[PDB]
């Protein structure tokens, strides 16, 4: 999260296993696997995708609470997604 230090709020990061459709709302988005991310306290969170192979999983991000900011701080912020692989990722069949 790349907002002002005085900016606060919550956001829902839900992961849906393969096959599952996009949730219709936050009510069913919370029922699955999710993390509740508040950026007033912690500025960076990690979501671990359980397992993938070559249907694929879905990752959606929801506004748990509105964006609350004080007077004099910018009214828009940005989120940067950094993705990686765990220690158990492997590849096979090299192809150009």
């Amino acid at each position: 999260f790349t907002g002002s230090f005085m900016a606060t709020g919550k956001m829902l990061i839900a992961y849906t296993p393969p096959g599952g459709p996009l949730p219709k709302d936050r009510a069913t988005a919370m029922l699955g696997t999710h993390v509740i991310w508040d950026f007033g306290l912690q500025s960076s969170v990690t979501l671990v995708i359980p397992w993938i192979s070559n249907t694929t999983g879905l990752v959606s991000i929801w506004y748990q609470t509105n964006y609350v900011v004080p007077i004099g701080a910018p009214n828009t912020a940005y989120i940067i997604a950094l993705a990686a692989a765990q220690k158990n990722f492997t590849m096979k069949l090299c192809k150009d």
């Binding site: 009510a27 919370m30 509740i36 508040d38 748990q64 007077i71």
Partner: protein, 191 residues
């Protein structure tokens, strides 16, 4: 943590309800337990397909406010919180995971004063002191088990004791988040 009545619930994940937007004209909100969780989730799937039920709860309330907002919230659990109308409708009596707005927060829709709620398990949410309030309530009833659909054990009341204040330009709505995790839940009588 506040352990309600000094007893830990005896003989299971976090549920996040819709955020409530605290404003200058807000009076208060109340949620009926466990009716708040019956309609949603795997927990509520057992409630509607079982006869009997018993469980504690772990209610956690958070407010996301900056340093330029002020106000105080009184969060408290009231066992057997019966509504008194000016009979209540169904939507007012057992509101789902969306609560209801108190029309008369002074008497709390029950003819009892707001000033005396501190006799119940409670915590204060003061925006300049803390933003968290967690209450651990055990199972309270005259019988070991009870129907989850026709009876509400207690009602979680969240009332703005002092109005929210802010300068023009700041965010006029303060979201209130409640995360409740059933603890020591039991079920019986699969229907």
């Amino acid at each position: 943590i506040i352990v309600g009545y000094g007893e830990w619930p005896s003989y299971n994940r976090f549920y996040t309800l819709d955020t409530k937007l605290w404003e200058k004209s807000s009076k208060g909100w109340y949620w009926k337990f466990p009716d708040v969780l019956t309609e949603t989730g795997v927990f509520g799937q057992n409630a509607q397909f079982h006869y009997l039920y018993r469980s504690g709860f772990c209610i956690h309330v958070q407010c996301n406010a900056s340093k330029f907002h002020q106000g105080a919230l009184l969060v408290a659990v009231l066992p057997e919180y019966v509504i008194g109308t000016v009979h209540p409708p169904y939507k007012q009596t057992q509101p789902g995971a969306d609560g209801f707005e108190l029309q008369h927060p002074y008497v709390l829709d029950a003819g009892i004063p707001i000033s005396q709620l501190t006799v119940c398990p409670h915590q204060w949410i003061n925006l300049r002191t803390n933003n968290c309030a967690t209450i651990i309530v055990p199972y309270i009833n005259a019988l070991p088990f009870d129907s989850a659909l026709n009876h509400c054990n207690f009602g979680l009341l969240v009332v703005p004791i002092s109005p929210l204040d802010y300068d023009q330009g700041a965010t006029p709505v303060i979201p209130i988040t409640i995360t409740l995790a059933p603890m020591c839940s039991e079920f019986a009588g699969l229907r």
